[PDB]
Design a protein around this ligand. Structure first.
Ligand SMILES: [Zn+2]
Ligand SMILES: [Zn+2]
Length: 1102
């Protein structure tokens, strides 16, 4: 508990309650003034204050009764998939059955209809083939009591039972109606008139053979076709439509789709029932990828007798495939083919009559449309890495090759005008055959350049994955494991393919030696015979909450998003995994903040201590104003088009009921912890199973290792954000008020932290002209020039003392926020805000680690990524694993994947990954180099110390002359200088000017300063500087410097007379220091709130 309040938190009256009660799940002090009562639903009734808590009560009532019904009617308990579907069925929500290959969709459909018939409600269950209509009824009749009115209908019906049904349908108040999809398509109007409380559908593809079926289903749950028409017009218009709130439909359930839900009619489901008819994207694999170093036909035989049965071969072409079919046939192995008998030779291996099936890439990779049995295919062999090959000659070289070359050469730049015959012409006249290849190899980084056969080989990560995933599918709760063995000797191919698999699938392909075959086979076949065994299912649902959609944008990019439930103010995605279902959605920002109105600008004080009072946030989409106070129109532009975060909080309460375990994965700081608390505290009366995880790499690995350090809400971090939020709110309102009563303007003062910085800027202009010293540039003959104290005139430099030594240069530690700002706002024409903004996009997309740190630590994973790159570039022996830091809060800014910035451009223009700009790539490049510089070999050089006498005045100049041994300098370059003989040198020309010893400020110099001085934290660095630009206290010039405006000078000068102890660096640093000790729990929380308070009242008197 942090002793705070939330204005719309209460589970009951839906209003104000504390931070200490809602955690325990109790209603507010008004609903239930009892401290720790025995029951809630009992006591609230005894106080005549029972209101909305009634819903969450009868919810768990009808659920546990439903769960009791299944347990009594059927065998064991519900599965995680079913438990999610059951909670959706009691709320009355329509949804898609997101599930793997037969988890029990047909089974659940009956128990619902039976449990709804027991209540009195009637339903209808639709299946494709009529063979299913009977078996559904066959199990139905021998299950339910005599009470239920079970009727059936199909094509091959009896002569008199056929008519017996249709009269009962039009009349007799039935309970369960089982019929075929054929029935729904033909008997449209009959069904449309009637109404069902529940409608179950098996094969959704059979239903989607027409538009007369979608309209029917919607009318089969109590929706007039009048609404459908108006809804059908708006989805046609180009946007979305909202169903009449007073309309109360039934419950429709559809299964996963085989093909894509293409059309406009399926959009009716999303806007009339708040659910999207999704298809099954099941990227849930557990495969071990091993690679054999060479196409040794003897070694394949060695592996085929390790697997014995259930092996697959993938040859590059039908040629070398037929060859392998000949070779193995002489060794008497049960081996078939696919290029001949696509059907018969397949079904034989399906039985066990054949042990090995040799296939191709575009033959079997295209003939996989039938069944695909993942319980037979245990092993997959790749006789040659799947890829495409283009021969480069006069012609034959594809258009995209001649494009990118001449794009950088210059002749195709004419609006990128594409041509077939013309691009051949451009080649011959300009480039010789040798010149052409040297240009292609110099441009196309990432792919394979085979100058021998004059071919271009580009790895097919798509084909490799599809051929691999045929040995790993989720069958009956258990997820079986397959093994993929690659046979490629061309090291450029194997490395290029391994890169894009670690980019897309994130799966390490390993060498042959570091893999135990007889050990891998065991955990493959044992996993196989466990999938078959009487599974005591253990699949479950999971909810995960982030604060940014961009995080979620890529979260779904590695999970396997199958559907999207637009639930209120947010949109929750759900994917398929081995642990069951997994739900995840974003908050699109914060949720709570201090109320500008009452209290000390949002702070109450009771029982001696301080109490913050929070409210839901509303960010307008038109003007963009942000406020906490509950309003309907934006008090800036009067637009009702607002974004109420309380409609998100209440939205998450609905979803919190459905899922089992809920995890909050936000920004691992104090800002992301404040949000993580406002949500867990909100979903604590609802769910009582909610934990915290902190993600640093938005990938498979960074997610797994985030749950390996799962914890609960650290209140110190929450306290830390509060104290700081209170700080700039209290002081920031006081000082800005002083400006109102002077300079006139309202909102100006951003606080204390941003104002002290302006103090440096005003007094940087002051001590600027103080050091305007005369200097001279001295261009030297045969050697490099240098600058010294000016006004010299003798044209001769005399070497006095010289000494050479062999020093070894070590690189600089990885980027922090202070480092990745300055060294990138320098080397790129960028401001600290734009730099930091690009960084967030690089982290929340899974390209770099956490972009808001102060540590330099690099874990073994970071060091291993570095080495695996140097081993890819060819120089593995220049690697040096540097720990860099013992005390590591977070981890230093580093690339999460061993892929250089040029390999990234290639993947994008190839058509694999996307959503990147050049402003992004140069920021990734700048970091990729720096990290790999900070993880390479040291440079052994040889530098000299020249002491030269110029105009009677000595001077010591140290410079590197030789690089004796290479190292880290391959990434971040090292500047060498020409040698100095111990002779006399003359000056060619002189440039006389007068720069300053004490220079000026830039956007980087500020961050540079407030890091040394100790003012601000990594998150606040980009903000503070840009804020000064915003208010108008600082302007830029020719050199893009930092100077105080006419406004900025008067503002700071005013404060230094009347309010100096509040804006002093020596006190500003003392606050950030103390507040950082609150973050670790060294200085008391309520203590530092009194200290902020004490200085405020003294300020409120001047
Ligand atoms: Zn209440
Ligand atoms: Zn507005």
């Amino acid at each position: 508990a942090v002793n705070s309040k939330y204005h719309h938190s209460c589970i009951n009256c839906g209003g104000l309650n504390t931070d200490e009660r809602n955690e325990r799940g109790l209603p507010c002090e008004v609903c239930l003034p009892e401290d720790s009562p025995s029951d809630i639903y009992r006591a609230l009734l005894e106080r005549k204050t029972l209101k909305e808590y009634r819903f969450y009560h009868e919810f768990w009532n009808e659920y546990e009764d439903f769960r009791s019904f299944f347990k009594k009617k059927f065998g064991k308990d519900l599965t995680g998939y079913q438990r999610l579907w059951a909670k959706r069925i009691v709320q009355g929500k329509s949804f898609t059955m997101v599930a793997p290959t037969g988890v029990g969709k047909t089974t659940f459909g009956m128990m619902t209809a039976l449990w709804l018939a027991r209540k009195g409600k009637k339903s209808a269950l639709v299946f494709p083939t009529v063979t299913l209509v009977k078996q559904t009824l066959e199990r139905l009749q021998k299950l339910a009591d005599e009470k239920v009115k079970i009727f059936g209908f199909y094509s091959s019906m009896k002569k008199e039972e056929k008519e017996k049904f249709e009269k009962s349908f039009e009349e007799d108040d039935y309970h369960i109606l089982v019929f075929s999809t054929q029935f729904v398509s033909k008997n449209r109007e009959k069904l449309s008139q009637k109404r069902f409380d529940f409608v179950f559908v098996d094969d959704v593809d059979a239903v989607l053979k027409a538009s007369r079926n979608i309209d029917t289903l919607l009318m089969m749950v109590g929706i007039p076709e009048e609404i459908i028409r108006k809804a059908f017009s708006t989805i046609k218009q180009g946007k979305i439509y909202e169903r009449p709130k007073n309309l109360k439909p039934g419950i429709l359930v559809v299964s996963s789709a085989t093909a894509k839900p293409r059309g406009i009619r399926p959009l009716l489901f999303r806007d009339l029932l708040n659910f999207t008819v999704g298809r099954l994207v099941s990227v849930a694999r557990n495969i071990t990828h091993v690679r054999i170093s060479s196409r040794s036909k003897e070694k394949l035989v060695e592996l085929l007798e390790i697997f014995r049965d259930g092996i697959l071969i993938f040859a590059q072409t039908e040629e070398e495939g037929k060859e392998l079919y000949e070779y193995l046939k002489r060794f008497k192995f049960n081996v078939g083919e696919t290029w001949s008998e696509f059907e018969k030779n397949f079904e034989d291996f399906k039985v066990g009559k054949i042990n090995i099936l040799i296939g191709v890439q575009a033959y079997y990779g295209k003939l996989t449309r039938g069944v695909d049995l993942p319980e037979r295919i245990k092993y997959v062999i790749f006789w040659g890495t799947p890829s495409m090959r283009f021969s480069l000659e006069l012609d034959k070289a594809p258009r995209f090759v001649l494009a990118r070359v001449l794009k950088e050469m210059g002749l195709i730049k004419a609006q990128e005008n594409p041509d077939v015959e013309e691009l051949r012409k451009i080649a011959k006249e300009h480039l010789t055959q040798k010149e052409f290849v040297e240009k292609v190899k110099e441009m196309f980084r990432g792919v394979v350049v085979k100058d021998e056969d004059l071919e271009l080989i580009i790895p097919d990560v798509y084909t490799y994955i599809q051929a691999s995933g045929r040995s790993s599918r989720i069958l009956n709760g258990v997820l079986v494991k397959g093994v993929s063995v690659i046979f490629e000797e061309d090291e450029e191919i194997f490395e290029s393919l391994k890169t894009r698999l670690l980019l897309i699938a994130e799966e390490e392909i390993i060498e042959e030696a570091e893999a135990n075959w007889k050990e891998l086979v065991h955990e493959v076949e044992e996993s196989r015979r466990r999938s078959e065994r009487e599974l005591t299912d253990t699949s479950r649902s999971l909810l995960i909450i982030v604060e940014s959609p961009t995080k979620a944008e890529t979260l779904s990019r590695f999970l396997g998003r199958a559907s999207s439930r637009k639930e209120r103010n947010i949109i929750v995605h759900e994917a398929v995994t081995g642990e069951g279902v997994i739900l995840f959605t974003a908050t699109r920002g914060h949720v709570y903040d201090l109320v500008t109105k009452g209290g000390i600008h949002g702070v109450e004080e009771e029982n001696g201590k301080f109490v913050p009072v929070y409210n839901s946030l509303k960010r307008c989409r038109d003007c963009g104003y942000q406020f906490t106070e509950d309003r309907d129109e934006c008090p800036v532009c009067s637009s009702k088009n607002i974004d109420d975060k309380t409609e998100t909080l209440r939205a998450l309460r609905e979803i919190s009921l459905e899922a089992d375990e809920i995890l909050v994965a936000t920004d691992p700081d104090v800002e992301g912890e404040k949000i993580s608390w406002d949500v867990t505290q909100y979903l604590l009366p609802s769910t009582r199973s909610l934990r915290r995880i902190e993600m640093h790499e938005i990938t498979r690995y960074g997610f797994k290792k985030a749950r390996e350090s799962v914890r609960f809400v650290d209140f110190n971090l929450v306290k830390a954000q509060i104290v700081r939020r209170v700080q700039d709110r209290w002081i920031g309102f006081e000082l800005s008020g002083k400006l109102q009563k002077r300079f006139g303007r309202s909102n100006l003062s951003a606080g204390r932290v941003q104002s002290t910085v302006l103090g440096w800027i005003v007094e940087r202009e002051e001590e600027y002209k103080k050091s305007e010293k005369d200097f001279t540039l001295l261009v030297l003959e045969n050697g490099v020039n240098l600058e010294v104290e000016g006004k010299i005139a003798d044209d001769v430099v005399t070497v006095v003392e010289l000494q050479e030594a062999e020093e070894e240069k070590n690189p600089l530690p990885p980027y922090t926020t202070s480092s990745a700002l300055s060294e990138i706002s320098q080397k790129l024409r960028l401001g600290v805000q734009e730099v930091m903004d690009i960084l967030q996009d690089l982290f929340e997309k899974g390209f770099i680690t956490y972009h808001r740190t102060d540590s330099t630590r690099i874990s073994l994973e970071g060091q291993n990524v570095a080495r695996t790159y140097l081993r890819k570039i060819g120089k593995e022996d220049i690697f040096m694993g540097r720990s860099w830091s013992t005390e590591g809060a977070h981890e230093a800014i580093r690339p999460v994947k061993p892929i250089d910035a040029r390999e990234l451009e290639e993947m994008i223009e190839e058509g694999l990954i996307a959503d990147l700009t050049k402003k992004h790539l140069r920021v990734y490049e700048l970091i990729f180099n720096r990290f790999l510089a900070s993880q390479s070999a040291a440079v052994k050089v040889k530098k000299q110390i020249v002491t030269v006498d110029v105009d009677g005045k000595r001077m010591g100049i140290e410079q590197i002359v030789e690089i004796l041994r290479d190292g880290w300098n391959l990434f971040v370059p090292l500047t060498v200088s020409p040698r100095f003989e111990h002779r006399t040198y003359k000056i060619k020309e002189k440039k006389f000017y007068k720069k300053h010893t004490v220079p000026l400020f830039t956007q980087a110099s500020i961050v540079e300063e407030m890091k040394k001085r100790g003012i601000g934290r990594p998150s606040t660095y980009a903000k503070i500087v840009e804020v000064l630009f915003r208010r108008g206290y600082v302007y830029e010039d020719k050199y893009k410097r930092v100077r105080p405006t006419r406004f900025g000078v008067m503002v700071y000068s005013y404060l230094k007379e009347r309010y100096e102890k509040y804006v002093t660096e020596e006190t500003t640093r003392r606050l950030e220091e103390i507040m950082d000790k609150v973050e670790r729990g060294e200085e008391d929380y309520q203590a530092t709130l009194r200290l902020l308070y004490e200085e405020i009242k003294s300020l409120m008197e001047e």
